[model samples]
Each structure stands twice: as structure tokens, then as C-alpha cells.
Target: EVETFAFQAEIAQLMSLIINTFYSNKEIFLRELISNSSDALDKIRYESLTDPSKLDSGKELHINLIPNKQDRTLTIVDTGIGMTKADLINNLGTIAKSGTKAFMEALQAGADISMIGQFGVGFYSAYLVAEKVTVITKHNDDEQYAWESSAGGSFTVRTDTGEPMGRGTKVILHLKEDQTEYLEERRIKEIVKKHSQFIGYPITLFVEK
Candidate 1:
């Protein structure tokens, strides 16, 4: 039931646009990632409350930030519901999800587009600050999987090459040379506070190993 796929060709233009101008500042990437993590934590908590058996996996919500200067990597980890391999491709490689054309049509038809929750396009934001990105995820429903990409139009998913934990996901941002500003504690902390201060879960900054 596990497999891998490639991002569609058109995604590159979107990736470039996102990396270049989606946000006024580079720090909002922290906000987007944290917001995604918060949504994930809420998803798992809701599911666990209804199905107690799922509670055997990851714990209460939390996010961790680890900045590595020697390696030039900035990593963020969240103990939330991890993705299955299919989830990775469907969520990361493709965009215009849930009949987006129809939805946009509906928007033009006078329907409000403000409350929609579909957002597969957000993953591209990583390219704004990373030359390469690695997603290490462990799912309660499946074995851990790692999805890596350069965001230049290709990505690969393989069995995780690290020790497996109970559940959740970690994203490693291999900072672009000029994006080293993200590898500082003061900067990362400030970034988190600016965008994620109201997140329902705790966000911690860890010294790189």
C-alpha cells in the first residue's frame, strides 16, 4: 500500500512563485509550517477522542524547532498525525485539490471561498528557504516514510532511514546559502512568536545536535 510519485510539471511555476513572492518576508515560512502542524495536532486529537485506540500513538500536541549551523539545516518536528505514503503524494505533489476549478467556479457563482480547508499547495513554501527539503514522518497507521525533494520538479519517498518513533512528522529544511538567517535562535524564536504565538500547542526551540 506504500508507493511514490512525482510532482506534476506545472508545479514548478507555482513553486517558483511561492518561493519568490507568496510572503513579504522569509520568516512566514515558519508560520505556515507551524500552522500546518497546529492543524495536524487538532486532527489527531479529534480522531483520538472519538477512537481512543488511536491514542496509543503520539501524545499531546507540540512542535520543536532545531537549528543546525554546522550543517546549515533548520528542522521542525511536530507530534501530530503523520502521513501515509499516499498522503504525501496527494498532499504535496498535486494542487488544485477537491475540485478546485469547481470551487473557484462556485466562488464566481457567488459562493464564499473563505472557509475552504483544502491546502495541498502550502508545501512548496519550503523552497523559499531551502535548497533541499526532507520530510521524515512516522504514522500510527503505517511505517515511517521520508519524502525528499529539491523543489525543482522532482521528489522521492523511501522508507525512513532513521530510528522510528511512535508518530508524527519532522521537516528538515536544508537552508539555501543566502537563507542562513533562519539558522539563528533569536531569529527563529522571533519568527515563531510573530506567526505562531497563538498556536494551541507549545513550540520549543532546540539547539542543533
Candidate 2:
């Protein structure tokens, strides 16, 4: 079933704050998202020790960067711990209510308390370059769902009846005209090498021919 959810009251204010204040460091968008993926990978790697189902979808633990020149999109796919429907609504719609902040704190509970920042800065920063963001994800604990938003004050989550997308999350950035720079394989490779070297998850980039 498809469902639409309105962002919390602070969404508009938060969006502009990030768009304006983060104009200069827009490149951080790639790094931030990769870091989030790495965190998810870490979580599953640790948990899979007890739950073998985590590998039912796929045993590989990696992240793929696909730049579709024809579609003007930059996609990041990770074989990591995916999210449930509740996680999507709570994490995406309730940014202002501290879902992102709480998620980071809980995810990094043992370390990096300073990882907390201006609300959902990491995920919300996608608006810095893309007109819209789409997340198609599957969790071993739940069914698949497609969550999308344009930061236009509302977002949608729908059941994905399409082909199985395996396990984990696939994030797509519908690049804005001026932000197509991210659709370059060279640019994405540089970003991953520079900022995500800490992750040993074998991040790979594929530029569609």
C-alpha cells in the first residue's frame, strides 16, 4: 500500500537552513550519505553474527555507486542493514522531532557522541544538489518499501511490488541541472576515496555506458 506523510513543522525552516548554510560545502552530501551506509554495514556485520537471516538476501557486503547519464541521476546502493517502514517514516518525516539525531546517538551509542549535528543534516543535505531523493530499501525484519521526497514539505512511502531488489537500501538522487557534476564516475570515485576510505566495504562505482 502507498502512504504519504507530511514532514514535521520544522521541515521548511530546516530545509532552507541547510540549503543556504551548506551551499559552500555541498560536496559533503556524498560523504555524509556514504558514511550513513557504512554505519548500516557495521550494524549488520555485528548483528549477522547471531542472525544468519541477514545473509539470506545476499552474502556480499558492499556499496555500489551508479551514475546514470541518461537519467541524470546518481545512485548509491548498499548491501547493508535495511530499514523497516516505521524506520522510514520516523527517520525521514520526523527529522525535526529528533529521529535523525536519536538514530545517530543510538547507532553510535558507544562512540562519536559528537556525530550529532543540525538535525538530519546528513540525509537532508541531498537537497543541496538533487531536486529529489528516492530510497528503495528492504529489511530482513520487514517488507520492502519505496520512500521518496522532494523536500517539498511532504514525502511518500509505498509498497514495492516490482522485482525484488535484494536486501539493503538503494538511494537515488535525481540531480538538478546544475548539480550534474555528481553524475560523473570520476567525481564520485574521488569522493568515496577521499571521505569513505575508513569503510572497507568495497565501494564500487558504475557509470552507465
Candidate 3:
């Protein structure tokens, strides 16, 4: 069974702003996503030191960028802490239901505040480049699941029947026609080096021979 939920009114409004005008350059979407992946890896690694049995206990931390121009898709995978069902609902669904109305008001008032980390909105930045975004994640405490959306005010989550991911997260971006440049190897390397070379985890880009 698939579960569906709507984004808070503020979240939907914010999505419109991001998709239409929030970023001066859309290529930085890669930077934001990789940075987020790096954070997840760091969080899991830190927690493992205390628990010892955390997900992918002995695996080396890394991020992989897989681009498929033939299919117009880009996937970012990380050996990092994945989200559980509750985590997905709380993190993706609610979208700062607390101060969201106020946040929207501030934006309307031209506060110039950053929305990247605010309300965990960085993930939605993907929609600026892709028509749809799909997330497959496996957490130690929960079964593997998939979350998908088109930034259309609502999202759906369902159990993933495929082989387990061991414990990590995968974000797949279905590119828009105008964003096909992101599917190029040279472009990906440049973006990674410029923004994520110093990131804590090893960032690898997979290119076809």
C-alpha cells in the first residue's frame, strides 16, 4: 500500500518560488544535494561510534553520481543514514508546519533569508532541474521504502520490493528537457569539483565508457 500526504501550504508556496526564481543558477542544485548527502554520511558515521551496529557498519562512506543521458536521469546515491517512515513523514511531509506561515510572510516581505536549510527545503531544489524526484532509502530501524514527488503539493511513499540497499539513500532526478546539461559527464565533474571536492565523503561520478 502506498501512503500519500500533502505538503503544507507554506511548503507548496515555497516550492513555486524555488522552481521559478529562488536560485540565480540551477546547476548549484548538485552542490546542495551533495552537501546534504555528505551531512547524512557524517551523521551516520558519528552515531556508529557510539552504537557500533549502525547500518552498513563496515562500509566506507561515499557518494555516487550516476548520469543517464539516454534516459534523461541523474541519480545521487550515498552510503549514509537513511530515513525511516516516521523520519520521512516528519522530514518531508510536515515541512515546518510550525512557523511556515510566518516564513512565507517573511519571504513576501523580502527578508532575504536563506531557505536551503530552512524547513529542510533543500531537497525540493531538485525540482528546479527535474520534472520528478524519486527517493529510495533503507534505514537500519526500518524497511526499505521509496518516496516520490513532482513538487505538486503532495508526495507518495511505499515499500520498496526491490533488493535491499543495505542501508543508505538514493535520489533519482528525472531531468527536464531544458536541464539536459546535467546529464553530461564533463558538466557533472565540473560541478562536483567546484562545490563538493572538499566534502567529507568521496564523491564519485559514473560515466559510460
Q: Could you estimate the TM-score for every candidate?
A: 0.82, 0.85, 0.88
List clashing residue pairs in candidate 2. none
Q: List the residue pairs that clash in candidate 3.
A: none
Candidates in order have lDDT scores of: 0.74, 0.77, 0.81
Off by over 4 Å in 2: 20-22, 91-96, 99-120
- lDDT measured at residue 32 in model 1 versus the true structure, 0 to 100: 74
Q: Give the top-scoring candidate (TM-score).
A: 3
Ranking by lDDT: 3, 2, 1
Summing lDDT over every window of 10 consecutive residues in candidate 2, give the lowest-scoring window.
111-120
Candidate 1 — which residues are off by over 4 angstroms?
Answer: 1-4, 19-24, 91-120
The deviation in Å at residue 1 for candidate 3 is 2.0
Question: Model 2 Cα displacement at 95 (Å)?
Answer: 5.9
Best by lDDT: 3
| Candidate 3 global lDDT | 0.81
Candidate 1: lDDT of 128?
74
Candidate 2 achieves a global lDDT of 0.77
